[PDB]
Each structure stands twice: as C-alpha cells, then as structure tokens.
Design a protein around this ligand. Structure first.
Ligand SMILES: NC(=O)c1ccc[n+]([C@@H]2O[C@H](COP(=O)([O-])OP(=O)(O)OC[C@H]3O[C@@H](n4cnc5c(N)ncnc54)[C@H](O)[C@@H]3O)[C@@H](O)[C@H]2O)c1
Ligand SMILES: NC(=O)c1ccc[n+]([C@@H]2O[C@H](COP(=O)([O-])OP(=O)(O)OC[C@H]3O[C@@H](n4cnc5c(N)ncnc54)[C@H](O)[C@@H]3O)[C@@H](O)[C@H]2O)c1
Ligand SMILES: C[C@@H]1O[C@H](OP(=O)(O)OP(=O)(O)OC[C@H]2O[C@@H](n3cnc4c(=O)[nH]c(N)nc43)[C@H](O)[C@@H]2O)[C@@H](O)[C@H](O)[C@@H]1O
Ligand SMILES: C[C@@H]1O[C@H](OP(=O)(O)OP(=O)(O)OC[C@H]2O[C@@H](n3cnc4c(=O)[nH]c(N)nc43)[C@H](O)[C@@H]2O)[C@@H](O)[C@H](O)[C@@H]1O
Lengths: 315, 319
C-alpha cells in the first residue's frame, strides 16, 4: 500500500510518517515546507519506500501527480493557526478549504481508496455539551479556522459518496509534542527564552482544553485507520483527545517549572470574554468513547502530556 | 432597510425580491443570469427602490461593490443542480463555496448586519432520523452539492463570529412553483410535452421527499428573518419544509393527470439503490417544529403543492 501524507514534513505529519514507515507502508510526502522542515523527516530521505515532493497544494498539477499510484491519502496539510483568522482569513481558507478541494478533485479520478483527514475540535464551536460527542450539533464554529475545517469535512464526505472512496474524519483536540512550531507551549518557551522575568499570557488564563501528546495521537490515528479499513462505513467520524483538560495558567506554571524559571505572569485579559483572540474557544474536551472502542486510550493525561512536551522541546 | 439579494433573478430569489419590494425595502439584486432571467424581475426594473447588478460573484470586486450601503444580504445565488455533481463538481464548488467565501470577505469590510442563507436538506445526507431536526449529526452529505452547502454554512458561521455580524441559516426542503427551470416537475412536463406516451422516471420512483410551494417558502423566510432580527442569536438554524412527503411516482401521476395524459412509466432503476443519480437522497422530510414556533405553517401540503405547481407551470407555458 502506498499512502500519501500531505503536510508530512510538519509536526503531526512527520510523526505519522515515522509510524507509517516503521509499519512498512510506502509513504509519499507532499509538503511546501511553508511550516514544515526536512529536519522533521530527514531520517527517511532516500529510503526505498519513501518519496518527498516539495509542492504547494494550491498547484493543481502537483496535487494530481502526488496522488498517482496511491491507495490511501492522509491529508494533514493546513495552516493550523486559529489566531490569524481575524486578520488573515483568506490564508486559512486557502490552506484548509481550497487545497482540500484540490486534493479531492485529484483523488476523484484516481485509485485512491481511503482518505483520512485531521479535522479539529473547533468544528464544535463553543460546545454546550462537554465531553463533546461526535454527534453534537448544530455545528457552529466561531473561528475562520474551525469553519474552514468543517468545510473541508463536508467536501470530503460529498466526494467520498459521489466518487466511491471511503473517508475517515478524525477531530483532534490540542495535539502537543516534539517538532511543533505552533501553540501555547512553544510560545511560552520562546517568551521565557527572551525574558525569564515576565510571561505574557493571552486571555484570562482560564481557557481550559484537552491536550493529547503526539505519541498517543499517532497511536490513535493508526488504530482508528485500521478499524476503519476493516469496516464498511463510507464516512466515519471520530474524536481524538484526552480524558481530562487543563488551563492556560497551569500550562504556564508547568512551562516555568520545567525551565527552572520564576516569571511574573501578566495576563492580557483577552477579548470576547477572556479568550486569547477572536475565535479562541474557551472550553474544550472531546468524548473519546467511540475511539476507545478500538482498544485505544491515552497513555498520558493532559498534565503529563504538557510536561513531557516541554521537556522534549527543551532538548 | 437596504438589502442585497444575490441570485435575486432566479426562482426563489425573484419571489423574495417581489415580497421585499412590496413591503417597501430598498432592494439590490446581484445575479449573473446563468440560470435566472430579467423576465423574473422585469416588473421592478426602473423602480427607484430597485437596483440590478448583472455580475458573477466569482469576481470579488463585483461583490465588494454589491454589499456597499447594504444592511442585510439574502444569499440565494448558487447552482442548485445536485445531478451535475458526478460530472462537474467544480461548478458546484464555485457556485456554492467560492462565491459564498467572496461574499463573506466583502461583508467583512462593510456595514452589513444580517446574512440570510438558503441552505439545503442535502446537508443531512441520507438522514437516519426522519423527520430530521436542525441538530441532527454527524452531518454526512452524499452529494457534492450538499457538501458545498454545508461548507458554505460553516464559513458563514465562522465569519459571523469572527467579524461580528448575525447569520440566519435556513435549510430548505424541495421548493417548487412558478419561475422554476429546475426540478422533477419541470423535467416531467418537458418530457411529456416531447412524448406524451412515455415518461422516463429516474431511479425506482420510490424517492420520497417533502415539497413546499414557493408561496409558503417566502412567507417562511420572512417570518424567520423577522423573528431572527428580533432575536439574540449570533447564528441560527432553521429547517423549512412541509409536514408530509411524496414519491416521484406520485409526482409523475399528478403531472400526468394535470396534462390529461396517461403515459407508460419507464423507470431507469437509478444507482446506489434506486437513486436518480449519484448523491440523490432517497428519503427526505425535515422537522419544522422550530420554524412552527415562529407562527409559520405551510398553507399547502406536498401533494397540493405539486399539483398547484403543475397547473402554474402549464398556464405559464401556454402564455
Ligand atoms: N496541532 C494540533 O493541535 C492540531 C489539532 C487539530 C487538528 N490539527 C490538524 O492536523 C494537521 C497537521 O497540523 P500540525 O500541527 O502538524 O501543523 P504543521 O504546520 O506543523 O504541519 C502542517 C503541514 O502542512 C504544510 N502545508 C501548509 N500549507 C501547505 C500547502 N499549501 N501545500 C502543501 N503543504 C502545505 C506545512 O508546510 C506543514 O508541513 C492539520 O490538518 C491541522 O489542522 C492539528
Ligand atoms: N429550489 C429548491 O428546491 C431549493 C431548495 C433548497 C435550497 N435552495 C437554494 O435556494 C437558492 C436559490 O435556488 P433556486 O431554486 O432559486 O435556483 P435558481 O437557479 O433558480 O436561482 C439561483 C440564481 O443564482 C444565480 N447565480 C448562479 N451562479 C451565480 C454566480 N456565480 N454569481 C451570481 N449569481 C449566480 C443564477 O443565475 C440564478 O438566478 C440557492 O442557494 C439554492 O441552493 C433551493
Ligand atoms: C483543536 C486545535 O486547537 C488548537 O488551537 P488553540 O486552542 O489555540 O491552541 P494553542 O495555540 O496551543 O492555545 C491554547 C490556549 O492557550 C491560550 N494561549 C495563551 N497564551 C498563548 C500564547 O502566547 N500563544 C498561544 N498560541 N496560545 C496562548 C490560547 O489562547 C488558548 O486558550 C490548534 O493549534 C489546532 O490547529 C486545532 O485547532
Ligand atoms: C433539498 C433540495 O433538494 C433538491 O434536490 P432533488 O430532490 O434532487 O430535487 P429534484 O431535482 O426535483 O428531484 C426530485 C426527485 O425526482 C427524481 N427524478 C426522477 N426523474 C427525474 C427527472 O427526470 N428529473 C429530475 N430532476 N428529477 C427526477 C430525482 O432523482 C429525485 O429523486 C434540490 O433541487 C434543491 O436545490 C435542494 O437541495
């Protein structure tokens, strides 16, 4: 089986590439390195089962070529920066709706049999049912990013039914670990690297969300993928997150602890009710009963995930 | 109130334009006449309260210009042909996702306060709960058209929250009536005008869906709009359909009755289990409890709606 991994030179994408290569798949990565890096996958360059394609998925010919001789696609290429939605929604539209559409047009007339998509908890919006289940509705995303992720999901479903392939949609919580160049942990580490006396924390520090270490995330994506392949569902929806959640204040405390620092916390107060930025969901915790029915469970909770992530990053 | 109506020269759009003009709104229509027609709105041309812009919403400059000095937008512009999804999905993507994205970027830099959007029951896909309520999930559209409608909804919600305007999303069932140049009734009438002894029926004839006459639909869109303006919600979701449903076979029988014909029925058998085409939902019936709590109710049921539409279209054809 050949599997294409868009965004495979990124954080989640590079870890999933590691896993796919170790399990013996033929892996083709398509990445424009706008955010990713060859350092994330240099261990695999030159492997007789590995191909790298430096390309922007806006380029429709590149995408058509990438899906050639591919039996499965893992579509992780995206701009995952919620914060930019208020200032640059077109960027999010291009990196979440447009290139997904391009992928689907290419997949349409191809031998691609399976399409796996890393969606986001942000599709649930400010969810009123917590833990949020896969069947929560109406879906009312509050950010351009979450809206774009939901749009991608919808297109994937329609194309899967119209053009006879199968789609696995996995709505991930906040995923953290080594190689990430986005997110609160990364920014706190750099902030304290620049000034260890004072740390600016966006919002009111109470934003509370479920964090999943990348190890558990790849394990989950793979067990879900396997179970999906063995089923008949044309399109299936799974949450992937942790059992618990944790606040931004506590994350700041862990980041400080691990760096043997003692900054003053300076909260900005945020916007729209203590949010870090327009569209920042304040409370997120996904239900993972459906995924647990595959034999998957987080080996770490959110606190352990955060602490391991900080230590990994510092090395 | 100044309102822009995209797709206002089309089927639903022109009737909504009529209603807005009669109520004294200042109406601006944006339509590229790809499906619509000047004849649908010619009664209003030259009225000091009516402006028409023949423009393609693919052009972002046209749309930016269109939303200027507008307090509300009714976004009805789209290509509504589910059937084409298998052969030209790109067209659907452009006329349901892309132009909606452009509209939202234009609204972002504008004084528009309200956005009303005609979404579709197809966003529910082959729903397992019938009557289907607004909070049914997971949403799993089976057509490129339904997927595009759902994507548009999602973008509308995200933009509404990020950029602080209010959005009313109305998921319509099958809407029928005068001025329609799409749908099973139009096609059956044309089929029998070309050969009145034989009617080809796509699928197995058991496709069963809820039909709403356009009169009831405009009344409903207006009651929802009014209540929404008076409400608090940032984004709201309403189904708009009938209480009942009806099969394609019965629609063919009504069409035949009204045409004083009795043709041989030729079912194609369809695909994916009797569907008319890839993505054709087989069973659709929306719950309208939420809409009913605004004081709205269909004045016609699906059978009556279909019969009124057949008679309307036939008198239209004579004229
Ligand atoms: N990290 C999280 O917490 C999280 C949570 C939920 C969902 N996701 C989703 O998981 C996927 C990966 O996220 P990540 O954290 O690894 O992000 P990342 O930025 O580290 O990786 C994404 C990759 O996409 C590539 N890319 C971006 N635009 C591209 C384009 N136009 N053409 C080709 N390649 C392009 C980038 O270069 C990068 O390698 C995305 O779909 C993201 O939305 C991530
Ligand atoms: N008729 C139904 O049963 C039904 C049901 C549910 C939802 N809807 C929705 O209601 C709306 C109107 O449907 P309708 O039956 O009146 O269709 P229609 O084709 O009669 O009207 C749509 C209008 O959009 C215009 N248009 C298309 N592409 C355009 C573009 N790029 N720029 C500008 N204008 C463009 C067409 O010229 C036409 O005038 C659509 O959003 C449709 O999806 C219709
Ligand atoms: C579901 C996933 O949600 C994830 O969003 P998202 O909660 O912002 O993920 P983070 O960017 O890690 O932010 C987590 C929380 O920390 C707050 N925060 C406080 N200070 C900072 C800071 O300096 N930087 C950052 N980045 N956050 C900060 C942030 O507003 C939010 O409440 C996405 O990364 C994924 O793509 C996906 O959408
Ligand atoms: C919810 C609404 O659903 C509506 O879809 P949709 O049921 O296909 O609406 P129609 O195109 O009217 O098709 C209604 C039913 O009639 C069947 N049918 C049988 N023979 C024919 C034929 O010759 N022509 C046509 N056209 N249909 C035919 C068709 O497959 C479907 O089962 C959309 O038009 C709206 O935009 C909206 O999405």
């Amino acid at each position: 089986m050949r599997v294409l991994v868009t965004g495979g030179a990124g954080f989640i994408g590079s870890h999933l590439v590691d896993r796919l290569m170790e399990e013996g798949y033929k892996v083709r990565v398509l990445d424009d390195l706008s955010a990713g890096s060859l350092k994330n996958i240099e261990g695999w360059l030159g492997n007789e089962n590995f191909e790298f394609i430096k390309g922007d998925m806006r380029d429709v010919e590149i995408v058509s070529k990438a899906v050639k001789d591919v039996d499965a696609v893992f579509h992780l290429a995206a701009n995952p920066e919620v914060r930019i939605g208020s200032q640059s929604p077109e960027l999010l539209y291009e990196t979440n709706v447009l290139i997904t559409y391009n992928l689907l047009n290419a997949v349409r007339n191809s031998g691609v049999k399976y399409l796996v998509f890393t969606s986001s908890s942000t599709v649930y919006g400010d969810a009123k049912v917590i833990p949020t289940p896969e069947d929560y509705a109406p879906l009312e995303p509050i950010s351009v990013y979450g809206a774009a992720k939901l749009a991608a999901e919808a297109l994937i479903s329609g194309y899967a039914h119209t053009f006879d392939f199968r789609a696995l949609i996995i709505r991930l919580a906040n995923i953290i670990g080594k190689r990430s160049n986005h997110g609160v942990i990364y920014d706190f580490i750099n902030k304290l690297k620049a000034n260890p006396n004072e740390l600016e924390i966006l919002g009111d520090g109470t934003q509370r969300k479920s964090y999943l270490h990348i190890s558990d995330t790849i394990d989950g994506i793979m067990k879900l993928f396997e179970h999906f392949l063995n089923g008949e569902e044309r399109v299936d929806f799974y949450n992937l997150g942790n059992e618990d959640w944790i606040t931004v204040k506590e994350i700041a405390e862990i980041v400080s602890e691990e760096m043997n620092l003692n900054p003053r916390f300076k909260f900005t107060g945020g916007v729209d009710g203590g949010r870090g930025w327009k569209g920042d969901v304040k409370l997120m915790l996904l239900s993972i009963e459906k995924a647990k029915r595959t034999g998957w469970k987080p080996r770490m909770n959110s606190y352990e995930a955060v602490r391991k992530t900080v230590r990994e990053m510092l090395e």
